[PDB]
Amino acid sequence: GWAIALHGGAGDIPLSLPPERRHPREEALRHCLQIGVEALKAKLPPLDVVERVVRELENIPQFNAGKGSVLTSNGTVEMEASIMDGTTMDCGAVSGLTTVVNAISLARLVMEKTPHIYLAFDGAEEFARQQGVETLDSSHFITAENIERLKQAKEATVGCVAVDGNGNLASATSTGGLVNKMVGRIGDTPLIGAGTYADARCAVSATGKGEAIIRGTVARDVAALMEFKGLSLEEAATCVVHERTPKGTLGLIAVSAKGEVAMPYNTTGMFRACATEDGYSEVAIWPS
Amino acid sequence: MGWAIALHGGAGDIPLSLPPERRHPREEALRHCLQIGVEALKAKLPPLDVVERVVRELENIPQFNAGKGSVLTSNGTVEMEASIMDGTTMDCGAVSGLTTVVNAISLARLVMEKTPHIYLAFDGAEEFARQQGVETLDSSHFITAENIERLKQAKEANTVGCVAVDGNGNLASATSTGGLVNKMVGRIGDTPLIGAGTYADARCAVSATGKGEAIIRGTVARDVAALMEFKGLSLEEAATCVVHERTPKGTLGLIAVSAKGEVAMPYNTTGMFRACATEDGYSEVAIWPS
Ligand SMILES: [Cl-]
Numbered sequence: 318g319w320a321i322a323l324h325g326g327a328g329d330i331p332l333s334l335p336p337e338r339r340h341p342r343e344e345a346l347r348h349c350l351q352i353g354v355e356a357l358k359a360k361l362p363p364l365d366v367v368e369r370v371v372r373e374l375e376n377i378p379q380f381n382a383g384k385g386s387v388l389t390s391n392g393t394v395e396m397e398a399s400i401m402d403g404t405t406m407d408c409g410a411v412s413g414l415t416t417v418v419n420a421i422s423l424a425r426l427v428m429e430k431t432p433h434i435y436l437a438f439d440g441a442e443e444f445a446r447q448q449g450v451e452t453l454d455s456s457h458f459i460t461a462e463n464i465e466r467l468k469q470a471k472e473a474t475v476g477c478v479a480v481d482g483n484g485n486l487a488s489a490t491s492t493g494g495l496v497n498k499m500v501g502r503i504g505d506t507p508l509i510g511a512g513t514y515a516d517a518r519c520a521v522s523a524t525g526k527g528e529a530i531i532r533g534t535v536a537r538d539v540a541a542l543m544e545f546k547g548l549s550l551e552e553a554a555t556c557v558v559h560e561r562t563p564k565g566t567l568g569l570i571a572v573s574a575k576g577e578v579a580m581p582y583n584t585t586g587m588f589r590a591c592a593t594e595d596g597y598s599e600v601a602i603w604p605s
Numbered sequence: 606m607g608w609a610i611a612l613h614g615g616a617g618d619i620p621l622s623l624p625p626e627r628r629h630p631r632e633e634a635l636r637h638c639l640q641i642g643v644e645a646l647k648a649k650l651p652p653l654d655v656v657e658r659v660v661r662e663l664e665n666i667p668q669f670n671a672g673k674g675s676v677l678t679s680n681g682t683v684e685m686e687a688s689i690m691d692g693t694t695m696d697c698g699a700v701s702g703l704t705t706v707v708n709a710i711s712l713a714r715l716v717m718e719k720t721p722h723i724y725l726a727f728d729g730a731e732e733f734a735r736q737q738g739v740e741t742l743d744s745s746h747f748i749t750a751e752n753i754e755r756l757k758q759a760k761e762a763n764t765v766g767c768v769a770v771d772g773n774g775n776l777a778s779a780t781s782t783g784g785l786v787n788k789m790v791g792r793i794g795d796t797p798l799i800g801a802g803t804y805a806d807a808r809c810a811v812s813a814t815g816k817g818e819a820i821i822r823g824t825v826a827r828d829v830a831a832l833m834e835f836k837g838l839s840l841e842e843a844a845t846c847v848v849h850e851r852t853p854k855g856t857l858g859l860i861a862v863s864a865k866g867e868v869a870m871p872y873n874t875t876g877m878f879r880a881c882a883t884e885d886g887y888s889e890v891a892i893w894p895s
Pocket residue numbers: 492494495504505506525526527528
């Protein structure tokens with residue numbers, strides 16, 4: 318049957334995270350899970366499901382994508398996303414977005430409306446205007462929390478995977494990237510086979526230290542272990558997270574064509590949720 | 606078995622009737638650039654320096670779609686991209702959106718060496734280039750008469766690389782391109798994406814060429830390495846499986862070397878401008894199938 322997983326990012330989420338900051342993030346996870354489950358039960362194809370959920374996770378200011386993107390070194394927002402359809406292996410990606418309200422929707426339009434997969438920076442902003450997507454002033458995306466985070470860094474990702482009852486799979490990832498990143502830095506989120514992958518067998522969205530995820534080709538590696546060694550989703554995701562990538566760098570979510578779900582992480586925490594047709598659902602931050 | 610090097614000047618529908626005056630300089634360029642890599646490997650230059658030196662020269666040859674001679678965007682502009690990977694460390698570097706940088710591959714290497722990042726693109730990459738003091742020239746330098754005409758033909762109708770291994774099994778890959786003629790401004794292809802156009806690990810080094818979007822979707826360079834690592838396929842078995850089973854005909858060619866000094870250069874296109882050499886005394890320059 319159908320299955321959905323989502324994340325609001327992996328990293329060093331401290332156990333002492335105050336309730337005032339925990340609660341809104343938990344509420345956001347549970348609300349996005351309800352949106353994605355409602356969508357699958359309304360017979361929306363998995364590509365529409367992961368777009369719809371990641372649009373919400375972009376709009377949530379407590380998550381690093383869309384509004385609440387982390388700031389470049391220059392105190393600016395540069396947003397990036399990718400989307401992949403497992404059944405066609407069609408895909409779309411964008412980098413260097415500064416005014417586009419929903420980066421993941423622009424990635425979808427590159428896939429549908431152009432002969433290309435990947436547009437970035439000024440050409441991606443020009444395509445956004447040609448398509449008439451929603452834009453706001455760059456100041457919309459910058460939060461007080463992210464101004465402070467950049468100050469402290471100089472001193473010192475969201476995702477959705479879904480499968481319907483017919484084995485159709487999709488993956489969507491969106492980010493502001495890494496605090497204090499150099500202007501023009503591209504991380505793992507928009508790279509097919511790093512942050513995002515979907516094929517006949519699985520759909521994967523990765524989150525964490527961008528450069529490690531690129532070097533590790535994490536999303537492709539999950540799919541490759543299932544295809545080339547006959548590993549189950551759980552075996553393939555476990556091996557990548559706990560065997561092949563360094564501690565404190567990576568988490569991912571994955572669903573299979575058979576409707577299984579895996580959300581392993583090697584970080585302290587990962588803001589995560591999932592639901593299956595088989596009546597499993599969970600919302601979590603830390604290990605249980 | 607000792608050192609080995611392979612290089613390409615791109616794969617695609619190179620017609621069997623390609624007249625001598627387009628074939629000639631490209632075959633000579635392959636032989637010239639192979640000499641650069643052979644002399645470097647005979648001098649025991651690290652593979653990462655070998656592939657950078659060869660691809661710099663391939664960028665400079667105006668008949669190849671990289672550096673000077675890069676194909677034109679829809680707007681008649683050059684937007685250049687490159688990636689480089691060290692198989693021993695899996696250290697890598699990538700650049701997209703370069704308009705004035707003479708050698709894209711060398712800025713990919715500086716990202717890897719001088720920053721905490723793998724990949725810089727467009728204004729931020731051009732600004733890193735200026736901080737680093739690398740050679741830049743006016744955007745008009747990169748535009749050739751041949752590519753003005755190619756773009757005119759594309760609107761009407763509507764890659765280079767090097768892999769090297771030393772006798773100690775150290776592996777490197779480098780790939781540089783103008784991209785696709787009449788591409789939208791800001792379009793990124795496979796060349797700068799680690800695991801699509803470029804990959805190196807302890808077992809192999811891979812550079813891919815052909816239709817960017819097919820190579821992204823097929824994660825070609827990573828797939829060769831994954832079949833060797835996860836199925837125990839030879840370099841040849843893995844390379845041939847990717848090109849002749851896992852990807853559409855007419856889209857892709859690749860060059861690859863193994864830790865053991867094996868060479869493979871399969872393609873599913875009409876042709877692929879290619880050359881290789883091994884310490885065992887083999888060398889080859891070719892365009893079409895034998
Ligand atoms: Cl990142």
